[PDB]
Design a protein around this ligand. Structure first.
Ligand SMILES: [Co+2]
Lengths: 12, 211
C-alpha cells in the first residue's frame, strides 16, 4: 500500500 | 485522432508517456473527456491495474484502456506497438482476467445499463457525483437528480445508488425506502458493474430499507 497519483478504489 | 491520459504513473513514468506521445503525434492531457481515446494504466507484469476514476471512465466510454507497458515497449522497440497486445485485463478488486476494457470496447450497443434509471443520492468520496453520473450515463443509464424525479410507468427500472460510509449523521441512508419505490444499492454495485463491463445483480449490494 502507497498511492502514487489518483485516488484508488479498493477492496469492498 | 489520439488523445490519452494516464493513471497511477510517477512523474518519470509520465515523461516516457510524454516522450512517447511526442514521437507518435498523440495528444496527451490531464483530464479524460469524450475525445480521449486511450487511458494508460500503471499495471503489473500481466496487465492488472488498480481501480481509478479514469479506469472506470475509460471503460465506461469504450476507450483503449492499456498498460503502461504499451508505452515502455513501444519505446524499447522504437515503434508503436498494438493496443490489443497491451489491453489491461483485470484489476486488484474485480479479478485479474475479466477483460472489462475489451468487453466494453466491443459492446458499445449492448450497453450494460440500458433502460435503467439511476440516481446518485449524494454525497461521495473521491469522485464528484457528476462523474459517477457521467459514468452511469456512458453506460446507458439515465440520471435522475432527485428521489421524486423517477420516471415510473412502464418498462423503466429505477435504482438509487449510495455510498453509506460517506455519510455524516448516518443511517439516514436507511430511510430511503420511505421516500420512494426503488432498490437502494451501494456504489460498489456501479463500480464492479463497470469494472466487469457487465451489469451485476443487486443482491449482494442491496441496502436494506426501513419501511
Ligand atoms: Co424488469
Amino acid at each position: 500500500p502507497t498511492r502514487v497519483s489518483s485516488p484508488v478504489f479498493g477492496a469492498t | 485522432r489520439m488523445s490519452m491520459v494516464v493513471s497511477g504513473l510517477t512523474p518519470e513514468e509520465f515523461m516516457l508517456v510524454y516522450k512517447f506521445a511526442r514521437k507518435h503525434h498523440i495528444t496527451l492531457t490531464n483530464l479524460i473527456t469524450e475525445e480521449t481515446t486511450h487511458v494508460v494504466m500503471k499495471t503489473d507484469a500481466e496487465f492488472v491495474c488498480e481501480r481509478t476514476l479514469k479506469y472506470f471512465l475509460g471503460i465506461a466510454g469504450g476507450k483503449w484502456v492499456v498498460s503502461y507497458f504499451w508505452v515502455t515497449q513501444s519505446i524499447k522497440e522504437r515503434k508503436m506497438l498494438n493496443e490489443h497486445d497491451f489491453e489491461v485485463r483485470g484489476d486488484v478488486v474485480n479479478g485479474r482476467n475479466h477483460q472489462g476494457p475489451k468487453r466494453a470496447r466491443e459492446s458499445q450497443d449492448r450497453k450494460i445499463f440500458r433502460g435503467l434509471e439511476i440516481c446518485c443520492y449524494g454525497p461521495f468520496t473521491n469522485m464528484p457525483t457528476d462523474q459517477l453520473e457521467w459514468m452511469v450515463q456512458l453506460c446507458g443509464a439515465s440520471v435522475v437528480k432527485e428521489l421524486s424525479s423517477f420516471t415510473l410507468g412502464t418498462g423503466v427500472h429505477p435504482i438509487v445508488v449510495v455510498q453509506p460510509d460517506a455519510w455524516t449523521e448516518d443511517n439516514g441512508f436507511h430511510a430511503i425506502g420511505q421516500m420512494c419505490e426503488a432498490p437502494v444499492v451501494t456504489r460498489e454495485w456501479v463500480l464492479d458493474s463497470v469494472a466487469l463491463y457487465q451489469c451485476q445483480e443487486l443482491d449482494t449490494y442491496l441496502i436494506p430499507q426501513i419501511p
